[PDB]
């Protein structure tokens, strides 16, 4: 099931509550989801975490 998901979903997989609130209320959406705790994201800083 995960393999059949696009890479965008895997980015924001764990943050549905923030995502769908933002999508319905015309606000900016989250950018980390559950991947925020990966080591590589931790090494990044500032806006580079989103990239």
């Amino acid at each position: 099931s995960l393999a059949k998901s696009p890479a965008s979903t895997i980015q924001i997989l764990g943050a549905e509550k923030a995502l769908f609130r933002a999508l319905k209320t015309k606000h900016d959406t989250p950018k980390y989801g559950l991947l925020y705790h990966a080591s590589l994201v931790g090494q990044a800083t500032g806006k580079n975490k989103g990239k």
Binding site: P6, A7, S8
Partner: protein
């Protein structure tokens, strides 16, 4: 490349790659495996083109599973470099999707190729 199936012949690839170019100029083309995966989920995909020389082939092998689930035609073309140039970008493309539009100026050509891909499956 046994996994790539059905693989279009040279005559059919030219027809597929011709529609991909026309769709690109009309902004009726979605490029990339991730962006092609979405169109299947939204049910807006006429058919999916994939590149057989993608390495490792598995990165695009989820689309046949989604396509047979949604009953969307799909076909493989031998070269991903050629697919990218047809799409109209500077990078190789391993997958692309033709978006559904019943008011499109190239509707007849898409359906003509779509029928041929169905026969191939």
């Amino acid at each position: 490349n046994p996994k790539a199936f059905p693989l279009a012949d040279a005559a059919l690839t030219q027809q597929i790659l011709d529609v991909v170019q026309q769709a690109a100029n009309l902004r009726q083309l979605k490029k990339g495996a991730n962006e092609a995966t979405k169109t299947l989920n939204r049910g807006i995909s006429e058919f999916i083109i994939m590149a057989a020389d993608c390495e490792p082939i598995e990165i695009l092998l989820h689309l046949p599973l989604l396509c047979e689930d949604k009953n969307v035609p799909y076909v493989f073309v031998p070269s991903r470099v050629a697919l990218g140039r047809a799409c109209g970008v500077s990078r190789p493309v391993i997958a692309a999707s033709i978006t559904t539009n019943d008011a499109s100026a190239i509707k007849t050509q898409i359906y003509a190729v779509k029928d041929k891909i169905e026969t191939l499956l």
